[PDB]
Symmetry: C2
Subunit: 113 residues, 2 copies
């Protein structure tokens, strides 16, 4: 029975990789397009970090640790870069996901009997 955590708000993640990006190259960790391509590669490194695994064979948890480790890393990074972008676009991801979900919930009526 694995959950995540309530905190940090998404708000707050928007928080940590902004002051964080501030003590570093501005246009670098500041061009949305830098953070995005940073994410795509990360979503990219994740792809490969699952490229030859069997949709079946010992999943993420049943591997060496430098793997779940980094796999957990490309995940953390895809999200950090997802969060940093969103922030920059002043998109309120928390609210955006909502109707997206409320919207997706619509478009896709559930199927009873």
């Amino acid at each position: 029975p694995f959950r995540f955590s309530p905190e940090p708000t998404l708000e707050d993640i928007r928080r940590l990789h902004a002051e964080f990006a501030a003590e570093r190259d501005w246009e670098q960790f500041h061009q949305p397009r830098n953070l995005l391509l940073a994410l795509v590669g990360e979503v990219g490194e994740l792809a490969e970090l699952f490229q030859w695994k069997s949709d079946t064979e010992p999943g993420p948890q049943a591997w060496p640790p430098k793997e779940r480790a980094a796999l957990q890393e490309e995940l953390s990074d895809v999200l950090i870069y997802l969060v940093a972008l969103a922030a920059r676009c002043h998109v309120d991801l928390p609210q955006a996901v909502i109707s997206k979900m409320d919207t997706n919930r619509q478009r896709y009526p559930v199927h009873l009997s």
Copy 2:
């Protein structure tokens, strides 16, 4: 000083989805690589917007109606599949981005 929302949390959202796929084609949302490829697809949905955007022209912040909506849902669809994928992998997102700061606090001095 711009704000997301203090909720819904990645867990809140996480629920809207596990449940929303609960009542739907479930096993379809189970197989990891189904989620990974869906995350990839959405990223292209995303990149399709960013792709032609010149730096000089309006920027993400000025992005108008039909723009922010698609992006939002887009950033959002990326988030859901990513909050889902980590779940299928036993990874704690909110609680980690912090943790992983280390890689980055070093990947960038």
